[PDB]
DNA sequence: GCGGTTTTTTCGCGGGGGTCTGCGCGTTCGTGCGTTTTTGCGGTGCTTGTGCAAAAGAGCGGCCTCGGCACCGGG
């Protein structure tokens, strides 16, 4: 979370392959897929802090 | 100190392949969050106790004059 000016810019990161979560290979938070593209982060702003 | 022997140090060149290194992902161990069990200094209410105006008569002690006597000196 980063309050830049009057807007609060919060970047929500999501699980993405390549040294991501500390979870072991046995259980993956996503389905295995070389052709799968992932939403890595979304940044939102709001006037209400 | 001076002359001898001859080992193994210094000199250089070629080839091999184990070690270093670029790159990636994962994890395990370093670092912060939170807590357990106990030690310590902080204060109080109450206990137990302390230093800081004449008038008059009655009675008294000191004192003094005096009484009266015993005594020294002499024969």
CA torsion A39-A22-A25-A43 (nearest 10°) is 0
Q: If you write DSSP's letter for every residue of A1-49 in order, what string do you get?
A: -EEETTEEEEEEE---SSS--SS-TTS-SS---TT-----EEEE--S--
Residues 6+ away with beta carbon under 8 Å from A10: A1, A2, A43, A44
List all nucleotides in chain B with at least one atom under 7 A from a protein Cβ: 24-28
Method: cryo-EM
A48 CA from B74 C1′ (Å): 161
Would the Cβ of A15 be found within 7 angstroms of any atom in strand B?
no
Dihedral angle sign, alpha carbons of residues A17, A19, A23, A27: positive
């Amino acid at each position: 979370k980063n309050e830049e000016g009057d807007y609060m810019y919060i970047r929500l990161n999501f699980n993405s392959p390549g040294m991501g979560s500390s979870v072991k290979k046995t259980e993956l938070p996503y389905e295995d897929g070389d052709d799968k593209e992932f939403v890595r982060s979304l940044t939102f702003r709001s006037t209400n802090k």
